[PDB]
Design an enzyme around this catalytic site. Structure first.
Site, mmCIF file in Angstrom:
data_model
loop_
_atom_site.group_PDB
_atom_site.id
_atom_site.type_symbol
_atom_site.label_atom_id
_atom_site.label_comp_id
_atom_site.label_asym_id
_atom_site.label_seq_id
_atom_site.Cartn_x
_atom_site.Cartn_y
_atom_site.Cartn_z
ATOM 1 N N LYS A 48 -33.629 -80.840 -35.638
ATOM 2 C CA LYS A 48 -34.053 -82.082 -36.280
ATOM 3 C C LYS A 48 -35.430 -82.532 -35.804
ATOM 4 O O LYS A 48 -36.360 -82.651 -36.601
ATOM 5 C CB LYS A 48 -33.032 -83.194 -36.026
ATOM 6 N N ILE A 82 -40.205 -81.369 -24.013
ATOM 7 C CA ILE A 82 -40.003 -82.746 -24.451
ATOM 8 C C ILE A 82 -38.627 -83.273 -24.045
ATOM 9 O O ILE A 82 -38.458 -84.467 -23.787
ATOM 10 C CB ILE A 82 -40.155 -82.864 -25.983
ATOM 11 N N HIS A 103 -36.068 -94.179 -16.665
ATOM 12 C CA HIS A 103 -36.453 -92.844 -16.220
ATOM 13 C C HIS A 103 -35.593 -92.388 -15.047
ATOM 14 O O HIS A 103 -35.264 -93.177 -14.161
ATOM 15 C CB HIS A 103 -37.932 -92.810 -15.823
ATOM 16 N N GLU A 113 -45.481 -95.375 -11.448
ATOM 17 C CA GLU A 113 -44.346 -96.281 -11.378
ATOM 18 C C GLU A 113 -43.549 -96.007 -10.106
ATOM 19 O O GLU A 113 -43.952 -95.188 -9.286
ATOM 20 C CB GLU A 113 -43.461 -96.127 -12.616
HETATM 21 C C1 LIG Z 1 -34.586 -82.174 -27.241
HETATM 22 C C2 LIG Z 1 -34.101 -83.137 -28.329
HETATM 23 C C3 LIG Z 1 -35.313 -83.749 -29.043
HETATM 24 C C4 LIG Z 1 -33.277 -82.350 -29.349
HETATM 25 O O1 LIG Z 1 -32.616 -83.253 -30.251
HETATM 26 P P1 LIG Z 1 -32.391 -82.731 -31.754
HETATM 27 O O2 LIG Z 1 -33.618 -82.262 -32.439
HETATM 28 O O3 LIG Z 1 -31.748 -83.860 -32.547
HETATM 29 O O4 LIG Z 1 -31.342 -81.534 -31.674
HETATM 30 P P2 LIG Z 1 -30.849 -80.459 -32.740
HETATM 31 O O5 LIG Z 1 -29.456 -80.073 -32.430
HETATM 32 O O6 LIG Z 1 -30.925 -81.085 -34.134
HETATM 33 O O7 LIG Z 1 -31.881 -79.231 -32.717
HETATM 34 C C5 LIG Z 1 -32.045 -78.404 -31.546
HETATM 35 C C6 LIG Z 1 -32.190 -76.973 -32.007
HETATM 36 O O8 LIG Z 1 -32.534 -76.128 -30.887
HETATM 37 C C7 LIG Z 1 -31.844 -74.906 -31.043
HETATM 38 N N1 LIG Z 1 -31.778 -74.232 -29.751
HETATM 39 C C8 LIG Z 1 -30.733 -74.227 -28.865
HETATM 40 N N2 LIG Z 1 -30.943 -73.510 -27.786
HETATM 41 C C9 LIG Z 1 -32.223 -73.008 -27.976
HETATM 42 C C10 LIG Z 1 -33.038 -72.172 -27.188
HETATM 43 N N3 LIG Z 1 -32.665 -71.663 -26.011
HETATM 44 N N4 LIG Z 1 -34.266 -71.867 -27.663
HETATM 45 C C11 LIG Z 1 -34.641 -72.365 -28.845
HETATM 46 N N5 LIG Z 1 -33.958 -73.158 -29.675
HETATM 47 C C12 LIG Z 1 -32.749 -73.445 -29.180
HETATM 48 C C13 LIG Z 1 -30.494 -75.285 -31.633
HETATM 49 O O9 LIG Z 1 -29.907 -74.176 -32.299
HETATM 50 C C14 LIG Z 1 -30.929 -76.365 -32.633
HETATM 51 O O10 LIG Z 1 -31.335 -75.745 -33.874
HETATM 52 P P3 LIG Z 1 -30.386 -75.556 -35.161
HETATM 53 O O11 LIG Z 1 -29.704 -76.834 -35.510
HETATM 54 O O12 LIG Z 1 -31.290 -75.041 -36.278
HETATM 55 O O13 LIG Z 1 -29.405 -74.449 -34.781
HETATM 56 C C15 LIG Z 1 -33.256 -84.265 -27.683
HETATM 57 O O14 LIG Z 1 -32.144 -83.725 -26.992
HETATM 58 C C16 LIG Z 1 -34.066 -85.156 -26.753
HETATM 59 O O15 LIG Z 1 -34.232 -84.835 -25.580
HETATM 60 N N6 LIG Z 1 -34.545 -86.288 -27.274
HETATM 61 C C17 LIG Z 1 -35.258 -87.279 -26.479
HETATM 62 C C18 LIG Z 1 -36.666 -86.834 -26.143
HETATM 63 C C19 LIG Z 1 -37.387 -87.827 -25.263
HETATM 64 O O16 LIG Z 1 -36.899 -88.926 -25.007
HETATM 65 N N7 LIG Z 1 -38.569 -87.439 -24.792
HETATM 66 C C20 LIG Z 1 -39.403 -88.284 -23.951
HETATM 67 C C21 LIG Z 1 -40.844 -88.305 -24.423
HETATM 68 S S1 LIG Z 1 -41.649 -89.681 -23.562
#
Ligand SMILES: CC(C)(COP(=O)(O)OP(=O)(O)OC[C@H]1O[C@@H](n2cnc3c(N)ncnc32)[C@H](O)[C@@H]1OP(=O)(O)O)[C@@H](O)C(=O)NCCC(=O)NCCS
Lengths: 393, 303
Positions: free
Chosen positions: B25, B102, B258, B216
């Site tokens: 996503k 990320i 955090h 921080e």
């Molecule tokens: C990492 C994150 C963005 C993923 O959430 P997401 O996009 O909704 O997750 P999804 O399940 O939809 O997609 C992850 C994909 O990675 C794939 N994946 C799993 N293991 C993998 C690997 N080893 N290598 C590559 N891709 C992999 C999964 O198959 C999935 O794809 P698919 O649905 O096509 O099969 C989320 O867990 C996250 O950490 N969000 C917060 C980020 C944040 O706060 N960052 C701080 C910035 S200040």
């Protein structure tokens, strides 16, 4: 995460760590039978609440002391009947006290030697570190102040695992001698493996010592868990005791919102942990007291905004709300829409100071303007903090 | 030495990026935004989904195949917490020059194991996890940050906070200074890049004439940064450094959002970090809203 004394010790004993033999009872009769089954020369009865100071606490039954010692199983049952179902008030509880549903019936052990032992991840040395001191039964932070020469550290390689030389050396530095040193070194290894297995951020044993009968025992311990590892620690996190938490913090946990209640009257929810900390800072610097810390994460959704408002109503100290949102590719007009929606539907009339930075700000300002709500649109963070402080008494 | 990979932090228009978690996503959404910005996104990886196209770009089963078929120099990771550490390790195994993770929520023990491998090689530079990323305004953007508040300029920004970064960026754009390179190192206690790693690059960078350091509570990265500045930013061409440290009013023993933002055992306080930085010649801004005006005062004072 919060574990009762019996929950953490059960977790330790299940992994080879030596603690007092104990049972946990729900009723007075269970406590009586548990006392018999122990086959102990002396029994200790401990009320199970999270707050400290149980020894000098008072029950709502009239009973003084949440920790009692006796050689008589029948006394255990009698005293338990004066504990279970009642509230225990200590110096670390609200005056109303905390309801006691369980008591611990454990073998009472004499303590000859007291040491301090802690295992945690070293942010600086990138790996597990053993922290020990022969001066136990004391806040370790004070020992570091007065006698830094008595704090011993062992850096552990995470891939290599704990070495026998490391465990032995720490045991010696703790003051254990002969067969007691070997027994202590083994327990340290068991404590290290437990630390890794349960994804703890820290396992602190105090006191870590020995009985006159020559056995190394973890008399009391505190375990802090890594929240990031909940998905692979389901059984442990299911044991979480939230009965002594701030009710608002608990409801916030439902919606995955990081809420920490404070002492002020200016509420605020902010996307980002750093920005929220900075917001609390700048509110204080301009003469205000923040009612809370509330992080929604960078990706701020509309539903999170609604739940946040829902949370801030449960706090009667709230006189104003500072909304500061910068980032997250949900445009400001959508946020503003959710703001006005929450204001009308949750029956809220405290003044809002709102700072939105992103796309569609002009439209957002419009949605805020014709909302007919007490909403002030600030231009920067300092401006927002000043206008929030000016909104309250 | 792992310090050899520091130069990989500086993305430019020649940087080619693949996305691990490409078909996910958030991987899809920010890949679309990356293509909008002009970032050379050349494909991505998802195990078992190789041999497909996504957003008009090739999808690969492994990083090594993705790197060999695209010549990618950077990888960004949008892999869920249970598998993100393994994704970082695969990236390290494939010797990808720059890896930006990320993902928020990686177990601390996982990252300790990751760092064990990371510090014993020098090909791969890791930013994150739990980080916004890195951006060279108008040239290359890798991560979450909004690229329209940016402006190619003279101020290098490094921060443990993503949203505070946006404040510092917007303010430096407002006063016309702009940014040379912006790096978010994230809010995790165990990451691949600290303040000194970026300061090293900022000091050696001709395009960088000033530095904003945003920190921080928790850890000792700010204190380490101050020590580094005493030794490396002391004449004859020393660059001005302005800082803001969040959490002056933070309570002890609480993880302030955090994972790394916590005051435990009397260590990690914000006031000590402020003191250490000031002693290193850093102008610490009392207010987060005055970073831009403060660095402007220092910049114009460079006569
Ligand atoms: C990492 C994150 C963005 C993923 O959430 P997401 O996009 O909704 O997750 P999804 O399940 O939809 O997609 C992850 C994909 O990675 C794939 N994946 C799993 N293991 C993998 C690997 N080893 N290598 C590559 N891709 C992999 C999964 O198959 C999935 O794809 P698919 O649905 O096509 O099969 C989320 O867990 C996250 O950490 N969000 C917060 C980020 C944040 O706060 N960052 C701080 C910035 S200040």
């Amino acid at each position: 995460m919060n574990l009762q004394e019996y929950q953490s010790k059960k977790l330790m004993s299940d992994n080879g760590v030596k603690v007092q033999r104990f049972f946990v009872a729900d009723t007075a009769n269970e406590a009586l039978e548990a006392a018999k089954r122990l086959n102990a020369k002396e029994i200790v009865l401990k009320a199970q609440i999270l707050a400290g100071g149980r020894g000098k606490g008072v029950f709502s039954s009239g009973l003084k002391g949440g920790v009692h010692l006796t050689k008589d199983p029948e006394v255990v049952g009698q005293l338990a009947k004066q504990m279970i179902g009642y509230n225990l008030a200590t110096k670390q509880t609200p005056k109303e006290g905390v309801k006691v549903n369980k008591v611990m019936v454990a073998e009472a052990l004499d303590i000859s030697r007291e040491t301090y032992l802690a295992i945690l991840m070293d942010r600086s040395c990138n790996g597990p570190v053993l922290v020990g001191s022969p001066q136990g039964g004391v806040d370790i932070e004070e020992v570091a102040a007065s006698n830094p020469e008595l704090i011993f550290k062992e850096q552990i390689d995470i891939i290599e695992g704990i070495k026998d030389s490391q465990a032995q050396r720490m045991a010696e530095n703790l003051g254990f001698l002969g067969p007691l040193q070997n027994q202590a070194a083994d327990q340290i290894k068991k404590l290290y493996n437990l630390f890794l297995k349960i994804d703890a951020t820290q396992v602190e044993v105090n006191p870590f010592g020995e009985t006159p009968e020559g056995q190394v025992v973890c008399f009391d311990a505190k375990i802090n868990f890594d929240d990031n590892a909940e998905f692979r620690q389901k059984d442990i996190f299911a044991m979480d005791d939230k009965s002594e938490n701030e009710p608002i913090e608990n409801e916030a946990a439902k919606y995955d919102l990081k809420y920490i209640g404070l002492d002020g009257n200016i509420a605020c929810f902010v996307n980002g942990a750093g920005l929220a900390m900075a917001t609390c800072d700048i509110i204080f610097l301009n003469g205000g007291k923040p009612a809370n810390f509330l992080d929604l994460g960078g990706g701020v959704k509309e539903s999170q905004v609604y739940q946040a408002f829902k949370l801030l109503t449960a706090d009667p100290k709230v006189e104003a709300i500072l909304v500061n949102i910068f980032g997250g590719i949900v445009n400001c007009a959508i946020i503003a829409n959710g703001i006005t929606k929450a204001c009308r539907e949750l029956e809220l009339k405290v003044p809002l100071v709102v700072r939105l930075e992103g796309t569609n700000v002009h439209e957002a300002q419009n949605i805020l303007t014709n909302s007919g709500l007490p909403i002030t649109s600030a231009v920067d963070l300092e401006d927002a903090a000043k206008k929030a402080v000016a909104s309250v008494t | 030495s792992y310090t050899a990979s520091r130069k990989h932090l500086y993305v430019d228009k020649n940087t080619k990026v693949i996305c691990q978690g490409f078909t996910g996503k958030q991987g899809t959404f920010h890949s679309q935004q990356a293509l909008e910005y002009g970032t050379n996104l050349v494909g991505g990886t998802t195990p078992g989904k190789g041999g497909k196209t996504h957003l008009g770009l090739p999808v690969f089963n492994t990083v090594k195949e993705a790197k060999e078929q695209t010549g990618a120099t950077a990888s960004v990771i949008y892999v869920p917490p249970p598998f993100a550490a393994a994704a970082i390790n695969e990236a390290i195994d494939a010797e990808v020059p720059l890896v930006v993770c990320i993902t928020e929520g990686i177990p601390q023990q996982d990252m300790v194991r990751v760092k064990h491998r990371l510090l014993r090689q020098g090909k791969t530079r890791l930013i994150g996890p739990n980080c916004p990323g890195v951006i060279n305004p108008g040239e290359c953007k890798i991560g979450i940050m909004p690229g329209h508040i940016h402006k190619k300029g003279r101020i290098g920004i490094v921060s443990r906070s993503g949203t505070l970064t946006y404040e510092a960026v917007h303010q430096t754009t407002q006063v016309g200074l702009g940014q040379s390179l912006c790096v978010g190192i994230g809010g995790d206690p165990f990451n691949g890049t600290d303040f000194t790693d970026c300061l090293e690059i900022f000091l050696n960078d001709p395009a960088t004439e000033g530095i904003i350091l945003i920190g921080e509570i928790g850890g000792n990265a700010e204190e380490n940064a101050a020590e580094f500045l005493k030794q490396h930013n002391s004449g004859p061409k020393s660059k001005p450094v302005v800082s803001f440290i969040a959490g002056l009013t933070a309570p002890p023993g609480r993880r302030m959002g955090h994972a790394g933002a916590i005051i435990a055992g009397g260590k990690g306080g914000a006031k000590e970090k402020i003191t250490a930085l000031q002693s290193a010649g850093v102008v610490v801004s009392m207010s987060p809203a005055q970073l831009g005006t403060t660095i402007y005062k220092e910049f114009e004072k460079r006569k």
